[PDB]
């Protein structure tokens, strides 16, 4: 009775949606995230998890600040200057 009859007792949840990585890997009893380690100040990443690196890198998401950092870098980070009006 370790299989089909024992699968019916699975209703209480241990993990839930995390609020830093977004994945459903936030354990409720230990109060920590198994994906990124949310109560830790640092991101949980490893070099044995080489494929799990590239799922979450800088090239993955939006880069809503880093692309305009690159755009300001390619003209030398000018600030306050305006082009010549008509």
């Amino acid at each position: 009775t370790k299989g089909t009859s024992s699968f019916g007792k699975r209703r209480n949840k241990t993990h839930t949606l995390c609020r830093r990585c977004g994945s459903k890997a936030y354990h409720l009893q230990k109060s920590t995230c198994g994906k990124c380690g949310y109560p830790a100040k640092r991101k949980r990443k490893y070099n044995w998890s080489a494929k799990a690196k590239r799922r979450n890198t800088t090239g993955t998401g939006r880069m809503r600040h880093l692309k305009i950092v690159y755009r300001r870098f390619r003209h030398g980070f000018r600030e306050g200057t305006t082009p010549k009006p008509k």
């Binding site: 949840k13 839930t16 949606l17 459903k24």
Partner: protein
């Protein structure tokens, strides 16, 4: 669960709006490569994770 939370209800609310199919004008464009919505989640087939 009838006892929902706001975060879980908002997460279900986004998926309920994603569950709708494509319109009929989207395959009349020039460079169309979409015949149908391939991300149609049914409530019996895929259980949304969790």
């Amino acid at each position: 669960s009838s006892h929902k939370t706001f975060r879980i209800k908002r997460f279900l609310a986004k998926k309920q709006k994603q569950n709708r199919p494509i319109p009929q004008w989207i395959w009349m464009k020039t460079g169309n490569k979409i015949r149908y919505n391939s991300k149609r989640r049914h409530w019996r087939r895929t259980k949304l994770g969790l």
